[model samples]
Structures are given as C-alpha cells and as structure tokens.
Target: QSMRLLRASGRTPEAVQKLLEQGLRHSQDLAFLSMLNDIAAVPATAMPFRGYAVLGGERGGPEVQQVPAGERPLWFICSGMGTQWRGMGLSLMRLDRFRDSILRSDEAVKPFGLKVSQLLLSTDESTFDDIVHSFVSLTAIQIGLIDLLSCMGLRPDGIVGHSLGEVACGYADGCLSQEEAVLAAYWRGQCIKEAHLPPGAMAAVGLSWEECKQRCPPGVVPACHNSKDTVTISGPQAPVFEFVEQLRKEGVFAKEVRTGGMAFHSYFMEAIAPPLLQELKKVIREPKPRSARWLSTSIPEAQWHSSLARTSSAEYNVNNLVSPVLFQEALWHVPEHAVVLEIAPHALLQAVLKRGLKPSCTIIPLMKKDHRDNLEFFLAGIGRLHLSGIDANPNALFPPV
Candidate 1:
C-alpha cells in the first residue's frame, strides 16, 4: 500500500509488499496473491482500555448489584474465509441485516448472475470459484449472519473478523457500508488474481503457536495466531504444501485452512496491500470506530490512533505486517465468569481464551453444526452454571453462564 501510495493519505504499504516488489519480483503473482490474504494494520493510538469490578454482586436478586439495563452482552462474533458453503445463510436469512445484505450483494455481481443467498446455500461455479467469489461471499454472508442476529436483538458487544471475517467486522462496526464494502471486496478479489500463483490456504491447529513456530521450515511465518498453539498460516503453494505434509507426518493435523487466495495472514500478503489499502482508505478511513466495549486483537488492524491524521492510518496498517499479536492485551478486560461465545466456524478462540482468562471466565463457541448448536438452550443452562462456578457468594452474582 505504501509502495503505491507513498504520497496517498492515511496508510502505508505492507511488509509483504516490500519483499514482493524488491525481493520476489520474479513472481509478482505469488507476491501479490500472498499479500492479498494478509490482515493489514497501520498503528494509530493505543486503544483506551478499561476493566470492571464484577464484585460478584449480581446474585443478591432484586436488591443485588444487578447488571444494569441496556448493558449489552459481550457476544463477540468472528468469521472465517471461503467456508461460505452454499445454503449457509438459509436458516438465518430472515434477519433484516441478512435481507439487506441479500439486496446489496445481489447488486454487486449482477452481471455474473450471482445470488448472494444462493451462493451461501451453495455454489458449483468451478471456474468462478476464485478467491474473489469466495472472499466476497464469505465476507458478505458473515455480515449477513450477524445482521440477522442484530435484527433478532442479539446484537454484539465486540466483533472481530478473522481474515475475510474482518470485512464483516468493518461492516458490523459501522465502518463498511453494504454497497461500498462489497464493491471493495470485489476489487480485492481481482487484486489477488492479478498475482496468481500456486494455490494456497490458511491452516488452524491446536498446537501452541510457539510449538507451531518450532515446526516451521524457515520462512513459514504464523499469519493469524488466534491464541497459544492455535493459529492460521499462509505461504506459497509449494512451501505451505510441503509444511502441511510435514505437519501430518509429525502428528499435527495441519491441512489447508481455506481462504480466497494465498495472501493470508502470512508475510506473503504484501502483494495485495497496495490496492486493498487504497480501497480501504477510500471507504473505511472515512469513519472511526465508535462502538464501546469491543474485542479487538492487538493485531495492527484494530489500532486507532488518537491523532486522527491520515498518517496514523498508514502507520497502523503497515504495523500489522511487522507486529506480533498480543491476545492478552485484547482479552484482558473481557470479564471473568463471562459467557464469551466464539461466533465463528471453529472454536479457534477457546484455547486462547482459556489460557488468558481467569478460571471463572467461561468461553463457548457457536459452531454451525457442532454437537452444542442450540445457543439459547445452552445459554439458559450454562450461563447460570458459570455464575455458580465456585463464587464465594453465589448469591452475589448475576447469570453465571
């Protein structure tokens, strides 16, 4: 981004871009494709963080220190990329947000005859199963799911998107508008295609991130480290393919974690940074995130500098390339005994949440087809249990789970 926009306002180019342009110029596609998948960030201001005194006061009933009305639950939703399998939006399509998303996505690839809902339900367009399709659809659908929930009154407190999921995050946070965001996604897809290289993917694993790093065969950087040992890695098709092969042999079930392109969270993402950041600056840079009590990874993308200058945006976006994620910083104030739900495809967040939180804090995952799919049923049962999880005074808390 900085490479092309050295004179443009509000962002810098990514590290992957620097390496791709100067180091791996031979294969621009590999460079550009890799950069496309990266989660870019420009450091702004240090987020103002806060902590609450749960005080275990909700248990005293009417007289107890009850959680106040209008205090939204910290229902965090994170989405993954490309798993926007067909029919993904059907069961939850009644939502106003989803409906609106339907109308908007409809207008986007109209020439291609793409029904956003139909794609979510299923897509068999093999030739069109490109990263552009996957990225746009997955991002649109994830936003659709949340829009559905928001209409149902199950709105989020903090929302974060993983890779393509962040597009949804931008929308949820009131930063990405439907027409504008989808338009940006369309171009982002093309940007990656411009850098066509061997096919690659992001992988999530249970091994601690440190352990996973030890297994890397040099140059395999951890692209998205969710927490502890669990993370998503992106690299060239050959090296990534080779690493996953080695992982399986060494007892790690490291298969490809799907994305629209090779530009995942890894260092290879520089290629797409220039263009993606351009679109981002044009749309996303217009508004600052205003939501209070949101969960943001210490990943550079979440950073918002107090300066409010265009320069701040550029720095933060670039920082995402060179920085290491500090999960504890992100989750620190998310309360203990809180019902932290992972509204993503997999429980990529649970292990990290567990290690970072106090014992009283319990995290749940809203997996699409997992054994515990009924969230309301579980919320009714488990929330109470979490409240009762050995509080010195059970009577001093509110809903436990």
Candidate 2:
C-alpha cells in the first residue's frame, strides 16, 4: 500500500508530505515500510555495549564530575549523500532563519540551475529521485540547517561529516565560504550527473570488514565500515548482485541500501574525482578561528591548517568520494562532553553513531523516519541538547505557534 501511494505521489516533495499525513490515517502501511527498511539497514551481527557514570553529583545526578553546561562541546554531524527524501526540511522551512539559509544556498547553486527552496518544497516526486537533484538538495538542506542552528545559538565546538557530507562540514567550519560550498556541491553533483554510468547499488553486510573483503570479488569494495560488524559494499549491478547473494549463502545477513545509480565510494567513482578536485581548487580556503574543530574521516585525525587553499584539502575532498569512510576512527576523537547532531534531511547516520559510540554520547536526529511532525522532532532534539548542557535556544528552534 505504501508503494502504491509512493507511485501516486511520484515521490515528490509535496506528494511525500501528503503520504506522510495520510499515512497517519493508516500507520500500519508506513510503519511496516519503515520497519522493513530499518531492519535491512541494521546489521544482524551484534555486540552488547552501553555507557555508565556513577550517580550523586551536585545536580543529584551522575557521580562523575559533571561537565559544566557552558563548557560542554556541541558537535554538528553532517550526513553524506543518498539520504535525501521528499518533505525533508519542510517543517524547518516555516522558520525565518531556515528560509533565509535556503535563499543563500539557492543563490550559490543558481548557476547550476538548482534552487534549494523549490527542490526541498517541490511537488514533483520524480525530481526527488534524481541523483544530481538529491546531491544538491542534500547539501542545501545540510547547510541551511547549519545556518539555522547556529543562529539559534547552538554553535558547534566540534564537527564530523561522512563521505560527501564532509564538504558541508567544511562550510560549517569556515573552510569554504557559502559560495564556495554551494559551488562545491554543484560541481560534485555534476560529476555524478555527467558520469552516464550504468545502474548500481550498495549493500550493508553484517560481517567484519576483513571478512567481507576476503569474500568480495574484484568488482566489489568496502564502501564504508560503519561499525565493527557492518560494512557497506558498492560496485556495478551484476557484481553487487552476486556479492549480496554470496554473503547470504555464507549465512551472513546482507541487504541493499538505496543509492542513486552511480556506484559511490568505489573505483567507479574515480571518474568523477578529477573535475571535482579542479572545482575545489578554485574555491576552498583556510578555516576561521572559531569555525570549530573538524574531525576528518579522510585522514582519520584532527585537522587544522592556516590555509587549506594550498593544501591537499581539495584533493582530500575528491578522494573522500571514492574512499572507505574511516568513521569509526574519527568517532573516537569527538569530545566526551559533546552531543552529536545529525544535520541532514533524515536520520541515516544515527545507527552508525550508536554502534560506534558509548551510550553516554547522545545521538540526536533532527528528522525521524515517517514521523508526523519533523519540526517537533527537531524541537525535541533542541530540548534534549539543552538538558544535556548544550547552550541551545528552544524558542528560536521553533517559530511562534
């Protein structure tokens, strides 16, 4: 039934919104679809993990030395490409700051013929599924939310972005100006748009990266080692098809992750790298003093440069597209007092974060899958951040009722 509704709506932004609303009328359909997708995403391989702190501090809480509210770091986490969906950023659009951010992003991407606002609010579902459209819209939404959240006084002290999301993080950390960031998004999208490659898919395998690597053939490669037990594989259709089947036959749980036809984070993505690097050279810059400390997955280390302009930043951004994400290594560097915020249209990275971090590290996802009110979810996160000791302004997070 959800699939039927998706077809009717053509999965456009407006149509997807209606499906969500009516889906509330019969939540079973939406619920089942969401559950199925989530099941496929979560690896079957499991290891129990949780965090603990002794209780009975001045606040009558954990006995551990409480990090002062003002001192606790706020982390702004950026999600990579392939997480865009219809109606994302819709609730935030009503806020003045959110709209203003989109306008700024729209201008930066205008030369590329993509409007951030319309792409996020359009009624045409077909556009929602376009690869290039998804790429630009995802960046637009990420940057727009970064602007909005910063405006609300919820500034980041640290930053982490996965895959393409690293570009947005660069803008957040002032490594790229708004124009440069948008241009980066545009040219990056152009790489995939012009690739003209055959269709391909990515799959998450519930096995060790080492195990998967040993089993995978020539065409397939580990795209992301999200956790100890999970690795995503990418390549051409035939190879990935056989790859998934082989994993299943070996008694490992494996399932496809939705991707735009291009085989991202693999050799196939190499074709898109050269031009992308050239565009970055034209615009990337040095980071500002207060842009927050950036954790780069490409290098799996803390990075600070007086000038990224002459450094390998451009080349790093290009290499990031085709390289396996070192997210697990990067995750270890985020400050203990910081809370990770997913700055994207949906909650794609929450699972990855959960598997990688101690339970004490709060994972706040602004938008929930199939939720009734995206705004409410975002506001709740703001509330959680406040309770967790981050300086977040609740009133600014939401518009006047």
Candidate 3:
C-alpha cells in the first residue's frame, strides 16, 4: 500500500508535494494521502530534503525543530594531527570542490617542496607516518575542508582549535592568510624535525586534569584537557607508556595515540621555541583581528585581551606549542544551542564535544578518517546542518552536468 519515492530533491514544500503526487500516479498507490499527512506534519523550514524522504512511516522523521533566525550560532572546531590516516581524503577527491581545495593547498605548500595532494592521496601508510609530512598534510587537508565549506556558503560565527589545529584557525578566522597558514604549519614541522629532540609519546586517558595530576608519574604531563573525563598526556616515551599501562591496569580506559614519536604541547617542544618563533614571525607578521570570534584553546579566557591573544603573533604560536591546550576550559565559552562543526581530517573531537557541550548544541564533523564513501558522509553532515536551520547550499554538492 505504501510507495517509495527515490532521488528526491526539493527546496520547497510545494515542489515536494508535486514530486509525491507524480510518484503516486505512477505507482497507483492509494496510501499516498497518508504519506502527505506525515510530510505535512514536518515543518517546511526544517525539511530541506536532498536525499530520500520516507513516506507513510510509523517512525517519525529526523528530529528537527525550527530555530529562530540568528539564534543558532555556527562555530568551527578544528582538531590537530592525531586525526590523520593514510588515504584519508582519497574518497572525497571525487568531489570537484574538495579536490580543487586540496590542489590549491598543494600549491601553497610547493615552496616547501612538499606535495600535499600527493602525500594525502597516497595509499602507502609510511608516507603519512613521517611527522613532518603528517603535520603539513593534515594542515593542508584542514585548509581544503575549510575552503570547501566556505564555498558552500557556510561561515563560522566563531572558531576554536586544539594544538596544531590552532594553526588552521588562524586562517579560518582571517588572522592569517592561506599561504601564511600553510607555511606556518610547514615551519612548525620543519623546526621539530631539525631539532633532534628525544623520543616522546602522547596518549588519551579517561581521567580529568585533577585525576591525571594525582596519578601521573614524574616527567609525564597532561598535554590536553579535552573534556571533564578525557585528558591527553604527553612526555618522554618510556614514562608515557608506563603511565598508560598503570592506568589500564587500574581499569581506566587508556590508549596511545599516533604522534610520529613527538610530543606536542609539552616540555619537549620547548627546545624548538627560538627557531619556531623566528620562522613564525616571518610568516605571520602583523596578525590581523579575526573575521569571526575566536575562542583560544591555548590561552585562557583571562588573557584573551592581552597582546598574545589580541594578535596571533610569533610569541602566541610559541606559547601554543609548549602550553597545555585548555580545550575543556574554552568549551565553557561556547554558547548553548550553537551549531559546532569539527573541521579536521576526521571527527576526532566529536566524543569530546558531545561530553563537554550541552545536549542542545548541534555538533557535526565534516569528514571521517576512513569512511567508505567520503562524499556521502560529508553531504550528510551538510544535510544535518541544513536540518538544524543553517542555509548550507546542497547545490554545491552537484557540478554542471
């Protein structure tokens, strides 16, 4: 008695009704009226259908409500290096916008002799495992994703980033140019590479900052305060590994993360500060005020108005490299019911944000590390934004045919 209408794309309620009527006439289904009732029950403003629309279903459609205009602030939350994987953006290469963005980023990195697109598209795991390559490529990918989102008419009302992610935020917020952003990432990696710092490690432990302080051994420090129950510890490799083992034995969920044997946001990064600051100074000279509100994860809210936070200067970048990421503290500034998009190679911060933010906040990740169909997954993220009352252009998903 029920008929399924496939490949639906309508921007208006009337157009959707016409498509449904056509489907009914062709299938000769009398239950079409019941389907229309279900469709009518959904707010037209909240239903910007792009894919399949189930009709005559006992289960209700997507749980969406009308958000008042200008009330739902869109924020971009950028993540750092641990999110990358081999062939991460390979599937998304099918999309012209995404591909073009990456290529553009590749052009930006050419001066450093790093072919970002080649590294990102390669299937060889070892190619991406190099710390220098991984850092540059991950930043390029983030820039590409940011450009793609911008092309689709989506802009952030505010932006925040974790560790290396703050580099991309510099470009996202207009505090740094695209070239500056990519080169900043390049210099950061190069400095770390040239400085033969001793081996280090980082791991995510299911413990609060207070708990980590009490339980961690000497030489290990909490690198990132991700959420109330999650913290990333970094230091010398042996101590970090030993601490993780002890935490695991204590029945806490602890796992080592990939960082190419370099610990970020820890004492180990202090050695490269002089050279890193020198290079960053050349790249980000005269940092401008951000185009959007920026919540600093590296600097606390109390120092937001200070020169360090006022301009993303060389000193600020150095501070970010060696200081603990106050991500959990920054999340306190995110307004309730805001739409947050995790801009990364993967949805690395989804779990952290879910635990940190209010339930009403719509947290969406633009890409997944190894999704079977990257384009589909990305479009679904855009669809979620549309459903949540953002005017994300579905037309951008389609090229001239």
Candidate 4:
C-alpha cells in the first residue's frame, strides 16, 4: 500500500506513513523511503519538474541531451547568428505546419521581394552568405519550429531571445504579429544592405574576463560574453586584426567568428541603426499579449506591456544592435527545473548556457547541421517530450516521398 501510495503521490509523506502503518517493513520499503528522502533534500525551487525541448547548442558539436522525461514548464530560448548552414531548414520544411510557416512568411515579405524559402533552400552555399538572407532565414526557422511546437500542444511558460532572436521571441510571445515580425526582419536586413557598414570585424577570444579587459585595445569592445572564457570583440577591420594578432602573440585562442554581417552588438552597427529603426517604426505598430511570458536577453528583466510600444521604438531597435547581450543575467530567473529549447538548424548557445545554468536546468537542441536521419532524430525528440507529458503529435511526421 505504501508502494502504491508512493507511486500515486510520488512526493507525499503521508502515503509513506500509511505504508508504514500497514506492515511495510521490508528492505524495499526502506529503499523507497531513501529515494524519496533524496528527492525531498533537493531545493524546491531547483527541482526538475517536467520534460521540455531545448533549441540551441554548439553549432558543430554533437546533439544536446535527448528530450528529458516527465512534464515540466518550459523556458523557450532563442539565440542569434551562427549555426546556420546551406541545408539548415530543408528537412523541417517537410512538415505541414513547418512548410506553411515558411510559405506564410514568404507571402508576408513578397511585397519586399524577399522569399524566405528561396534564401533558405538554395543549393549554392554563397546564397546564405548575404547577411540579409542569413538573418531572414534564421528568423523563418525559429518561427517555423515554434509554430510546429505549438501545434504539438506544447507551449512555453516563458520565452527569451538573444540579439535578432528577440524578434523571434516577440512574435512567439504575442508582442508582435507574424507579419510584423517578418517585415521587421526584412526591413532590418534591407537597412543592413543599404548601410554598407565600414570594413570592420568581430572575433571570439578565449580568455578570462580580466584578461580580455586588460588585453583588448581601445578600438575593440567586448560585444558578446558567450562564456566567462569566451569574449567576442568588435571594431574597425584594422583594430580588430591588430587586437587578434596581439591575442595570438599572447598565446590566447582567438578566432574570427564569421558574423555574415557588420560588427553587430557593437559600434559598427550604429551606422545601420537609424535606418533600421525608421524602417521598424513603419511596421511595428502595437503589441498583443500571448500566453507565455517574455524575458529580455538584452535587458535581463521581466516586465509586461499591453502593447509593442515598449520595444517598437527606433531607439530600442538601435540599442539592440549596439548593446552587449545580457545572456548570463537573462537566464538566471528562468523558472527552476525548466528546459531551454533552441529551435534553429544547429546548436549555438548550449556551451555557454550550460556554463551559466545549474546542472538541474536541462538544455536541448532541435536539430543538427549534418545529421543523416533528420526526420527520425527530430521525431525522437518529440517522443521524449511526449513521454514527459507534453502533447506531441507523433503522426505529424511526413511520410517519405
């Protein structure tokens, strides 16, 4: 009976007491009690609750942990740039919801002459080289995966996005309509093309914060603190090259991470800011609330607004370009025991997220760049989420053509 009660309530002591009263004195009873005791020892706030899908991870690394077991609230996470490849969304587009999302985005941006599918599905690797194409494709993948997840009946309890990822969060969290999100990305991409930012570059320097601070030259600024040991710096081409040279001389691991765009999250983006902001204002009008909460990676805070006015301004958009990504702080308040899902083609933030988060907090990615069995792999993820009690439609998988 105690075992029965233990299985029923799982965490209630009363059930165990009932078992003890009913001749539950076997060693097995003690084992069960010991197990429950260990569970009780965990901090209530940090306890793993349910299963969730994590979307981002290291781009070229192995896939993140398999979908966790049990049902728990989720914190949807999105990161910008990197991790994209030639056939990024090729397999996902096979699903009905995923395909429709890309189609809808394509329709939305038709007036602007941008077809997200064309940019994303091209065979030429150079096609994705354009910053505009890259950003737009990234946005489409994020949105499409998000829509697919929702169709599976799994909804995020909270959402957070990094850099251009914030646009994805805004759309997912109901702050922006689908059209608004796509158009904003299109215009922003357009602005980037027209601005023709000066010759500048960015690099990821593997060094302690103190070392980075002391070694960086005046022209370079620490734009992204991907991890305590990894700092991304940006500035004009010459200074960036000079600083990287110095880092190499100092025996530091410094590599230029191709941004496919100007030095974003730094001063060089300022040239494109005004124009992008003006373009954003033309599209971002009002906000609408969604069921999930949004945590700002740029601001690292939680505040609700009735409308998009809180983040729709030209100044806010500009700031997004030139501000340091507050990934460390932004993830701190995510609900305890939450899973972070990265929805893009490849993992981009799991290494940094694992470093910043406690072991109890699980992070998983939806896909990998070169994985051979894309359909089977993603479906396996959904199966895990389903076992965790999240609603997943197993039949959603597209039959082989």
Candidate 5:
C-alpha cells in the first residue's frame, strides 16, 4: 500500500507546487457584477463589524482573535487625537472617574512635567502654566490623561494611537516612564511650534485621498488621511483653505481640524525633522516593544518596526511634508482575527479602519471624551466576562451596512 501511494503522489516538486495554485483562479470575470454582488451580499453586525469580501482575509465560521482556538471573544478600544481637548481631564477628575489617571499621570510625568497636566486641563486657555515650551509638557499631559483614564479600571485588550497619540502606547508598553513620555510630548509641541511652518491649517474633507490631493491648491499637502471621506491638509492658509472652499462646492465634507499656524505632518514642517532628531537624542532608545506590537505613522508605508528600522527617521518624518498615509495598509497589517483599538482623540480613524480592515478584523473607538455617562457607557460596551456579568455592547449593532 505504501509503495502504491508514493507512486501515485509523484516525487516532482512541480506536483507539490500545484497544491498552492489550486484556489488562485477566479470563476467569475465580470468586474462590475462581481463587485456589485459582493457588496450587496455583506451581512451586518454590531460595532467594529464589517464584511470580508471587499475587506478580504479569512472570514466566516470564525471570529477575530490574535490566537484563534478555544472560544472567540470581543475586543475594546480607545479614541485618538481630537479626543485630546485643552482641559480634557477636568470633567473626569471631577467625576472621580479620573483618580487613577491623575495619580498615574502625576507619577509617570512628575519628572518631566506631566505635573502640568492640571494646567492643561485648566478650562482657561490663557493659563499657559503647563510646559508648552517642552514637548514633555504637552504630550506627557495628554498621554497622562489617557493613562489616568485607563487607570480608571477601564481595561483594553490592546491599544493603538493616531498621529502624536502613538507616544501613548509607550505607557501601555511599560517602556514609557510617566515622566519621560510627558516631557517628550511637551518638548515635541515646542519643537513643532519652533518649526515656524507657513501660515495655514488642516481641514477635513470627505473624499478619497486622490480626490483630496488633486483638489488641494499648489503648496498645499495632505497631512493626515483620517479615512476615505475625511482627510487633513496642510499648506499656506490662503491657498490651502482657498482650495478647501472649492472642494466644498464640489460636494465634499470640509472642516478645519484645529486652529494653528503651521501645516503639521506636511512638507511645510520638513525643516523640523533634523532639529526634532536632536530633541529625540535627549531620550534613550531602548529595545522595541517585544511584548505588544506598537505601530508608527512616521513611516506610513510600513509601521512594523522591522520595516521602520530599514527607513531613516529623517525620511520617515511627516511633520511638514505631505505624507500619503497608508492607514489602509495599517488596517491590513492587523492579523485576520485581530482587533484594533484607537487611542486618538476622535473616532475618525476607526471609521477608516472599519472600511480598510479585513472584515475578519475588528476596529473600535476606545473613548472620545467624558460623556454624560461616559464611564458606564464605555464600560458597558467592553467584552463581557462570563463571570464578570458585563455586557459587551459592540458598535457594529447600529444600522445594517
């Protein structure tokens, strides 16, 4: 029997290679029909849920998980950028919802100036008591706010950040000493301010990257591509925003992200890269996050550290030059069963991740801000521990998509 089976299987390498090619061909060649049918056929679910066809990856008969086996489970996430308000921690502090955030931020940032967190959260915008002069001050303060919130007993299975928010993941990695992270952000802000970019601001226009890029006027560049319909642009104010008005008339969503002089993450800030590297010298570069994978937007082409190491930080810098962010690739990088949690200020990134991720992956917003019932509302949506009796309220439960 053994001799006969071996003869039938054949000893040729080409025969073995045939196994990999068996499922590579498509049965249907009609492009429009294929796309239309596939899009129309997708079933809906709760928040963070999407289809796998246009999204791709292993789908059906399985759930999103880092290690698939045993029982499938839900995931939790946080907000990024816009989530950072001037005095974001005040309300949470008053609610006692931020006691842990306060303590952790204080401890981690005491050395730098996260101690200025109290000041950043001060409702008075005029009180520049915080170390706005130091990157340590601004970043440390906002990151401290995130840590404080996490300390509130709101645990996430994993974490992610948007734009400057990636620094927050350092705290999650246990690599970021509260003091250092705070000081880094504070100084980073100062460095950015020092860059002296051209007079302009970023605006959100609901359109694809190409559309937005073509729509931008000369000297304008795309700073951040938040999602398919929303992107941030940087350049001279007159031309950048002047082009934005034209975009609005063309039937696209447009809004100023924040009031600032320079076009951050666009070419206008390119001059700051080398100087910023000098600032980075102030901090120690240790081992990468071995325990958890932390992605970087600096090199949107590749956030994986291995790929990141191959690219010079100078070339990867996005402070001033317009970078075509492959947030889509970022979503594609997450394992098929992976769940991405956003820690930026707004949930805009989540919207993009939702569309870009393989339907098999899950993308969610961690938290936007202190809502009326933020604590209860946010916690109630996290995974339900069979023993914990908490309800896992996924956002995919909304209108059928």
Candidate 6:
C-alpha cells in the first residue's frame, strides 16, 4: 500500500493551494503533503515507507511522476566556468546546510584573501562577469551544493566534471578536503591572473567535432565537444571572432561566450600550466582513490584506470586546463538509463547532456540561474530524483515539528 496511499492522497490544485495558505498561517498540510510526497515518491522496496493518507496534489500533478525506485545509477555532473550568474545561491541561503557549506568554503578561501561568502551574499550582479570572481564563486557554490545534496542523503554513484568542475568533483569523491578544493580554485584563479596572457576568445558553434576540426584555422581549435552537433572553439580574439563570423555566414549557429577575455582548454592556457600545476601540487598532495566512480572529460577512456584518472592529481588538473574537453566521448561511458544531476549554479549542461545522452536517461538540474524561487526549484529537483528511482530524503531539508 504505499502506492495505494499515494493514489488516495490526490487532491485538486485549488484545495492544495488553500491548504498551503492555511499551512503558512499556523507556521502546515503543505508540510504534511511534502512529507507524504517524499514518502510516496520512493518505492517501498528500496526503503520502508509507512502507509499514510494525506490530502496533496492531484493524482497527475505535473511535479509528480510514477516510476520505480533504484532502477538506475545516479551520476553527479559538474560544470566549469561561464555557467555562473549573479545572485545564484541567494534564495538557497535560507537553508542552514547550504549556507553552512558556503561558510565552510568561505573559511577555506579566507587565507587566500578571498571572501566567497560576500560575493554570494551580495545582491550586486555586476562582478560575476569577472573571471577570477566567477571561477572562485562558482567552485564554492558547487561545493556547497554538493554538500547540501549529501546532507539530504542524495549521494552520487559516480561523478563526471568538465574543466574547472573537476576540482569540485575531487571533493565530492572524497579525494580532496574542503580546504584543498576551495584553495585549488583560489590558486587556479591566481595563476591565470599572474600569467597575464593576452586576451583570448571562445565561441559556441553549432558544428560537430568532425565538421569543426576540418575547418579550424591555425590559431583556433575545437575546445569543448559538448555534443554531437555542438562544439566550442577557443583561440586568439581576432581569429575566433573571424571564424564565428564565417560560421554565421555559412548558416551555422555561433555565439561568443563571455569568458572574461580568456580562452580555456586551448593553447592560451599553456602559459599558466606551470604555475597552476605547482600550486595544485601543494593543494592536492597525497591524492587518494575516489570514493565514487569518476569519469573524466579531460582524460581519454583508455587512460581511465591509470593514475592520472584514478586520482585527482596536480598533473591531471593541468591536463584538464590545457586539453580539449572530451565531453562527447565521455558521454559514451555514461549508462544509458542513468540518472544524471547537473551540479552547477545553472543548468548549463542540461541541453548538451540531453543531446548527448540516451533518451532513456533522466537528467535533472539541481539549481537554475534565475529561478523565481531557488528553494522550490531545488526541492523540485530532489522530487524528480526521487521519482526517477533514487532514494532521496526530502525530510532532510526540514526539522520535525
């Protein structure tokens, strides 16, 4: 009877809204329904759910879906820079776990003279465009989000990351401590700042790797193989712009990415490699095997079992910086029916993963860029994960009355 309880709890939206309003006054069926949904969403075979009847959303509510539990492995997919936006985690700050995670990251970065909490807590949306701020803040936010999810008992069965996202992945996989992960981000930004490289450019082009590879000019190269039909090109500003113009003329979709005038995963990154590696070596000393399976977007499948891929080593991070992101190739290894969570401030990789992964897979983005209600959106993601056969504990977000 958990399924029977789920069916019996169905109520009209109007009724649920009335209860929601009334529930708020007493400082609560919304809470009861939320708890009911959480219990009913997960299959009883995976975890025993006491059968209880509660008035809730309609039987076919848009937010709820009927699916078996534990049918697929869960993978946490992290994104790199350029995915961050202003005031990303502002709404999520109300949650103690999310806030405390950010506080921990703030403490970690304090020795490096960066106050990540101020950047996240600020309402000012202007400074996020800066490369250093964006990199550090995005890493910190990702780390916080990972911790938040973990506190909710939603741990990943495997992990995958793109570019700088790999640093956060190291923390998620237990290969790096909180300080090490946050400091890794700090030094990464510092190395880029100190390198003082020329301003480079990057653009997303609607061309497959094969198509873009043949047409790439001398200075420009395909940086990220995002999907079968989309690749990001990186190079000097002039050539990248010219190439984008050419692609537009050829009836192709191409647009410049605001990367703070820097080209990542390109020859431009070579200048910062030495300094980045040295700094990372200090932070990632004594690398250990990952707590979860890690699929690298920077390392090829052939080298997955090797030391470079097995551990989040300093050399591996340098390789991630300079090497073209093999995201498309990496997708080949993801199980077709896996539940993939995009662990970033925005759902930057949602479209790409949809295009790359099998249709059978369920892709959920934990946080959105400018959601009207960040907490609601995040809770909805957890709901979706529960519906997709994952044992996500929604009660973890709340304390018992």
For each candidate, how many residue pairs have backbone atoms clashing (under 3 Å)? 53, 4, 0, 13, 50, 3
- Root-mean-square deviation per candidate: 19.5, 13.4, 6.3, 10.3, 16.8, 5.2
Preferred candidate (lDDT higher): 5 or 6: 6
TM-scores for all candidates? Answer: 0.61, 0.76, 0.84, 0.76, 0.62, 0.87
Q: Residue-wise lDDT of candidate 2 within 281-365, one digit each (tens)?
A: 7766542332437776665443444343223366767877878777777787776656889988887989888888876688888
lDDT of 1 by residue, 334-386 (tens): 66445565554344556657776667555655435322222322222223322
lDDT of 3: 0.77
Task: Compare candidates 3 and 5 on TM-score and give the better one.
Answer: 3
Summed over model 6, clashes come to 3
- Scored against the true structure, residue 159 in model 1 reaches a CA lDDT of 59
Better of 1 and 2 by lDDT: 2
**Candidate 2 global CA lDDT score:** 0.66
Backbone clashes in model 3, listed as residue pairs: none
Stretches > 4 Å off in candidate 1: 1-72, 94-97, 108-114, 121-128, 198-201, 205-207, 210-215, 245-255, 260-263, 290-292, 298-329, 344-401
- By lDDT, the best candidate is 3
lDDT tens digits by residue: candidate 3, 1-401: 23232223346545554664454454435354334333442333454543333233332132233334455899999898788888888867766777887787788777768788899767786887677787887788888788878886777888989998998999888788778888888888899989988999999999999988887888899999999889999999999998889889989999899787888899999999999999988888877865438888888877777877887777888899999999999888899889999999899889899999998899998888777656666666765675566666544544421
Q: For model 3, give the 10-residue run with minimal summed lDDT.
A: 56-65
* Comparison by TM-score, 1 against 4, better one: 4
Sort order, TM-score high to low: 6, 3, 2, 4, 5, 1
lDDT of 4: 0.65
Over 1-401, each residue of candidate 5 has an lDDT whose tens digit, in order, gives: 00000000112334322321221232132343233323322112211221111111121111111122332323323233344445443433433324444465566555544455566456665454322422333344345445544543444444444555545555665556555455446555666666665576777777777876686677777767656666777777777677778877877677776645556666666576676666655653542432344444445443454533332232222231234444444444455655455544334456667766667665545345444433332232232121122222121111112
Model 4 lDDT per residue over 28-54, tens place: 454443343233222213332322221
Give per-residue lDDT, candidate 5, residue 318. 29
The CA lDDT of each predicted structure is: 0.48, 0.66, 0.77, 0.65, 0.45, 0.76
Between candidates 1 and 3, the TM-score winner: 3
Alpha-carbon error at 216 in model 5, in Å?
3.4
